[PDB]
């Protein structure tokens, strides 16, 4: 599993093992990659893609954080002009002055804690690391890396993009967060582990009546004897005058 | 960008063509990934349930 355990908490270890039983991380990554490939095949000719490719992926790749590999390979009939790296929410992107024929897509799943639940920073850092890494081999220098935070249900991509891929990837991520089977199973297991389920007309009479009962208010008189300077002259106001 | 509104639709279906519940889709994915399917008794129970559902939906 790709989860790091800061501090020997056997309780949390058992709980996380129960949640991710039966190689759930690998199944989640597999489901995500198949869903993305299906989406790309359903919109193949619209973006000038010759075909998609299922890269041979080592099982550990799903939970391999030190290095990485390729997940999906896109082959083209025409040249793809590529743009400079931008985030998933970067509406304005600057075009790079180069083209390619084979385009790689990588999927990285993470379990972010409270301090490191920023998916965009993680995606950017890991894209700039794996691309310029020596134990990670990419088919092409140009591609996209999508980081998905299962602990907080986030997703962001920072790699190199070509025109027409932005909306496709956006709705692909939307639909895959909305209706992935493996992600739904993860959510259900987490829920089970957490045991959480879903005038001067009538006012004059009132004033007269209140003043009629104001006699009893004189029987209880309180003096706010606090914050007294105790230097000036004291007040000896009599009780009869105050009652009157 | 090029300019389009890609209709990215992802659905789970089976060899019978019926839409699958997320639990059923996950079960199918796990069975295919583990390399081993369900047992004979489970297969017979599933087939009987499917036949009963088809009979009930026919009226």
């Amino acid at each position: 599993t790709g989860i790091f355990m800061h501090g020997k908490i056997p309780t949390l270890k058992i709980s996380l093992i129960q949640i991710f039983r039966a190689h759930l991380w690998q199944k989640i990554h597999e489901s995500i990659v198949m869903d993305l490939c299906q989406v790309f095949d359903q919109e193949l000719d619209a973006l000038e893609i010759e075909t998609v490719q299922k890269e041979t992926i080592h099982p550990r790749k799903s939970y391999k954080m030190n290095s990485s590999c390729a997940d999906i390979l896109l082959f083209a009939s025409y040249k793809w002009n590529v743009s400079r790296p931008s985030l998933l929410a970067d509406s304005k992107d600057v075009m790079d002055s180069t083209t390619t024929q084979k385009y790689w897509i990588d999927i990285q799943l993470r379990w972010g804690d409270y301090d490191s639940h920023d998916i965009e920073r993680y995606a950017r850092a890991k894209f700039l690391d794996y691309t310029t890494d020596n134990m990670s081999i990419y088919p092409s220098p140009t591609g996209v890396l999508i980081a998905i935070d299962l602990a907080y249900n986030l997703h962001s991509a920072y790699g190199n993009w070509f025109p027409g891929s932005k909306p496709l990837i956006q709705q692909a991520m939307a639909k895959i967060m909305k209706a992935n089977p493996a992600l739904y199973v993860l959510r259900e297991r987490i829920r089970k582990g957490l045991q959480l389920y879903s005038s001067s007309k009538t006012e004059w009479r009132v004033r007269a009546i209140s003043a009629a009962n104001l006699h009893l208010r004189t029987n209880h008189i309180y003096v706010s004897s606090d914050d007294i300077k105790e230097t000036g002259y004291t007040y000896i106001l009599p009780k009869n005058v105050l009652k009157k | 960008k090029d300019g389009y509104k890609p209709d990215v639709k992802i659905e789970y279906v089976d060899e019978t063509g019926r839409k699958l519940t997320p639990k059923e889709a996950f079960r199918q994915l796990s069975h295919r990934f583990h390399g081993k399917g369900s047992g004979k008794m489970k297969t017979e129970r599933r087939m009987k349930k499917l036949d009963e559902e088809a009979l009930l939906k026919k009226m």
């Binding site: 199944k27 299906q38 041979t56 080592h58 | 990934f33 390399g35």
Partner: peptide, 18 residues
Amino acid sequence: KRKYRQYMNRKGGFNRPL
């Protein structure tokens, strides 16, 4: 498509088949 490749009891190379 919707093909789901095998993880357990493959006996071949570690990486997934195409």
